Ligand binder design. Sequence first.
Ligand SMILES: O=C1CC(CC(=O)Nc2ccc(Cl)cc2Cl)=NC(=O)N1
Length: 134
Amino acid sequence: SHMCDAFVGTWKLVSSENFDDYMKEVGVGFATRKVAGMAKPNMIISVNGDVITIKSESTFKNTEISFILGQEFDEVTADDRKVKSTITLDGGVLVHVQKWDGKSTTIKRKREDDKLVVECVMKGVTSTRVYERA
Ligand SMILES: O=C1CC(CC(=O)Nc2ccc(Cl)cc2Cl)=NC(=O)N1
């Protein structure tokens, strides 16, 4: 086993707060914000050796990243930013930093009770998205 095991499985979105405002801060345009904010994604997290895979499946888009902790990779986000991403495991929290155009956003994923809580931060603006097991 791995500590990273508490994240493995299939998760469904149960609540969102401030996601439109987070997307505005990131620079997402109107139409994409409207359709992406309507989405009710599933997150599917799996581990195979050192490689972690995070898939997001919804009616808006299906995305998949695979990565090794601490090792930078290029990511095309669902809103079509070309970013440089690094994901680390800090005190039990997956911390995902995306860099592009001199900007930065951080997405933290953590286990809290039976939920997986995703916190997305762009300067002063935080969105909190709560998932539970499917
Ligand atoms: O693993 C995650 C990551 C995340 C941030 C995100 O989804 N960003 C994003 C997604 C689509 C679009 Cl159009 C624009 C942006 Cl900023 N929220 C989540 O519930 N789970």
